[PDB]
């Protein structure tokens, strides 16, 4: 029952890669603490806060602001978003 589905990529979601942020599609039943813990378990990078929102398509989009610099770019390269 993983909280993470996949990184969310649109023109606006790739507008935050320069800002160290990375927006994910997660499980709508999850909370901010579960998303933070599961992202830190999945990649090891430390997260500073979680900006969650639920969309009209029935999904939940989470924006994780990392603490270490370039963690968003590293995760994007490891997933192949960039």
């Amino acid at each position: 029952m993983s909280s993470i589905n996949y990184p969310f990529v649109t023109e606006k979601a790739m507008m935050l890669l320069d800002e160290n942020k990375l927006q994910f599609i997660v499980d709508t039943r999850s909370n901010k603490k579960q998303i933070l813990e599961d992202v830190e378990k999945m990649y090891g990078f430390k997260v500073k806060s979680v900006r969650t929102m639920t969309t009209m398509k029935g999904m939940k989009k989470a924006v994780l602001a990392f603490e270490e610099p370039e963690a968003a770019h590293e995760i994007a390269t490891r997933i192949g978003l960039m």
């Binding site: 709508t28 639920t54 969309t55 009209m56 398509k57 029935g58």
Partner: peptide, 14 residues
């Protein structure tokens, strides 16, 4: 609430 918006989301994508 959450369930009302979920129902409206399903209605929208139907």
């Amino acid at each position: 609430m959450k369930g009302q918006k979920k129902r409206l989301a399903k209605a929208h994508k139907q």
